[PDB]
Amino acid sequence: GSAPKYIEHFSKFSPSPLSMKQFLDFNACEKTSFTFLRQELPVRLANIMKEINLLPDRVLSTPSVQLVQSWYVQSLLDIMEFLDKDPEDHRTLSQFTDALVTIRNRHNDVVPTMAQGVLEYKDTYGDDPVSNQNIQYFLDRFYLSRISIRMLINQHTLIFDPKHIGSIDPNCNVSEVVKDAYDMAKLLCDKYYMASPDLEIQEINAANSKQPIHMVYVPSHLYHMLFELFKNAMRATVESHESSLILPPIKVMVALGEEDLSIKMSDRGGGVPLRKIERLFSYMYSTAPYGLPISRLYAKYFQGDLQLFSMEGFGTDAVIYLKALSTDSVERLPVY
Numbered sequence: 001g002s003a004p005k006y007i008e009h010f011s012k013f014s015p016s017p018l019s020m021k022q023f024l025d026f027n028a029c030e031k032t033s034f035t036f037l038r039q040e041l042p043v044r045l046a047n048i049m050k051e052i053n054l055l056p057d058r059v060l061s062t063p064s065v066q067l068v069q070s071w072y073v074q075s076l077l078d079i080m081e082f083l084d085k086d087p088e089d090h091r092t093l094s095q096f097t098d099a100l101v102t103i104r105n106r107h108n109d110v111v112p113t114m115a116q117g118v119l120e121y122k123d124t125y126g127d128d129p130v131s132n133q134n135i136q137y138f139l140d141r142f143y144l145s146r147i148s149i150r151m152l153i154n155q156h157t158l159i160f161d162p163k164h165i166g167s168i169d170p171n172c173n174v175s176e177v178v179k180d181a182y183d184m185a186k187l188l189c190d191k192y193y194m195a196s197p198d199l200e201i202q203e204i205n206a207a208n209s210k211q212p213i214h215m216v217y218v219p220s221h222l223y224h225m226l227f228e229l230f231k232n233a234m235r236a237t238v239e240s241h242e243s244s245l246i247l248p249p250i251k252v253m254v255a256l257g258e259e260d261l262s263i264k265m266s267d268r269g270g271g272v273p274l275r276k277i278e279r280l281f282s283y284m285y286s287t288a289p290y291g292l293p294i295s296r297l298y299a300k301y302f303q304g305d306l307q308l309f310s311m312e313g314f315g316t317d318a319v320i321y322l323k324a325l326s327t328d329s330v331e332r333l334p335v336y
């Protein structure tokens with residue numbers, strides 16, 4: 001097979017970061033999505049794949065890793081078939097959309113799969129702080145790559161099967177997403193614990209004090225983040241107040257500045273000591289048999305961040321930082 005040489009060739013290129021604007025203005029035809037994607041997906045696949053091969057042999061050769069490696073190889077090849085094929089012919093384009101579907105689905109399990117490699121590495125070689133920085137280093141990169149691949153694939157399959165533009169909403173009402181996520185967390189909350197804290201939203205539109213706040217974002221990404229955060233702050237809030245009678249609400253503030261859109265979630269769940277805050281964002285230190293770390297990646301993906309500050313004995317604030325303007329929302333992609 002050619003697999004290694006394909007990887008060699010396409011890993012000389014660099015992934016091409018797109019902006020939400022550049023995403024938005026796409027439909028400027030499938031032909032163009034097609035010809036773009038058949039080059040770029042191979043690039044992004046190759047780049048992470050060569051980085052996977054920089055992993056030391058004791059990691060490199062466990063079942064978990066070798067398993068995802070096989071998936072990425074089959075994908076690269078699945079996409080290969082379409083290099084000499086041409087557009088104008090509408091079955092080329094249709095067979096492609098189908099190929100993009102199969103790939104996305106094949107990869108639905110990378111998270112639990114990799115997570116398994118961390119566990120067998122913990123039990124096999126130790127949980128030292130160095131291993132931890134490499135695992136952290138490698139996975140932050142690996143997942144992020146992975147997210148952007150999905151982003152491309154979803155932009156294609158959804159548009160070339162209007163208010164929305166695929167996975168993007170150009171009029172994303174943030175509190176709308178905040179509540180939905182809240183409502184879903186509460187449901188799970190009311191089931192397991194049969195109590196649940198309330199929600200207070202407040203907006204602060206700096207430039208336009210009385211205007212409801214809208215942005216251009218990918219709302220499922222935003223849902224995902226807010227969801228984990230609500231889960232966590234509910235869980236804490238309940239268990240911290242099980243001998244008490246009052247259950248403190250979860251206050252969220254959504255704030256819009258000249259370049260930031262920022263979302264704080266404040267809970268009175270009894271806090272976490274400074275010492276333990278790193279552990280929460282660590283893939284290794286929070287592995288037992290998404291979480292915060294993956295939700296963070298989503299934040300980073302379009303030049304955002306997601307941060308935590310607690311006060312032990314009281315509560316935790318968690319902040320989602322997003323870029324306010326489509327121009328600033330460029331993809332953050334790892335490169336080899």
Ligand SMILES: CC(C)c1ccc(COc2ccc(CC(=O)NCCN)cc2Cl)cc1
Pocket residue numbers: 055056059064065114115117118121130131134135138139
């Ligand atoms: C399966 C995935 C999650 C996984 C699980 C476990 C690991 C562990 O990765 C390590 C551990 C130790 C070292 C030191 C070393 O030998 N350095 C040599 C070069 N200085 C490097 C790496 Cl990349 C990575 C990825």
Ligand SMILES: CCNC(=O)CN(C(=O)c1ccc(O)cc1O)c1ccc(OC)cc1
Pocket residue numbers: 229232233234235236237239240267269270271272280308310315316318
């Ligand atoms: C006594 C109850 N105490 C907590 O459960 C502490 N707890 C926090 O305080 C906390 C942490 C993260 C967060 O975004 C919000 C929080 O309130 C916490 C919540 C979720 C979590 O998942 C692993 C770990 C810790």
Ligand SMILES: [Mg+2]
Pocket residue numbers: 307308309
């Ligand atoms: Mg932090």
